[PDB]
């Protein structure tokens, strides 16, 4: 066996992180973004629509975003990471969280 954190406890993670980087209005952008990823915009529009969103200054905040990644668009979002340089409420929050299992 192996030592993990739920995707619950990950995504409270991430979101206070958000919280602390970015606006109601920015997270409620992040939300819908995710929304449409979910129901079928591609993992590169996706990318893009989040490092436009994020911004320069913010754009690392996509590391976080990996663990909720689908394994098919997983390889596409690392080269993501590698290419922008980066690597080598509750009821808002309820849709986000039925997003991201959605998508797993």
């Keep these: 066996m192996e030592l993990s ?5 990950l995504l409270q993670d991430y979101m206070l992180t958000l919280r602390t980087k970015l ?8 939300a819908a973004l995710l929304h449409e990823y979910r129901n079928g915009a591609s993992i590169h529009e996706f990318c893009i629509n989040l490092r436009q969103l994020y911004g320069d200054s913010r754009k ?11 394994e098919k668009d997983s390889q596409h ?7 922008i340089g980066v690597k080598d409420w509750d009821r808002m ?3 986000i969280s039925s997003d991201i299992e959605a998508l797993g």
């Design 5 to 9: 954190a739920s995707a619950t406890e």
């Design 23 to 30: 606006s109601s209005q920015e997270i409620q952008q992040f």
């Design 77 to 83: 979002f690392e080269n993501f990471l590698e290419t």
């Design 60 to 70: 690392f905040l996509l590391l976080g975003l990996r663990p909720f990644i689908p």
């Design 93 to 95: 929050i309820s849709d």
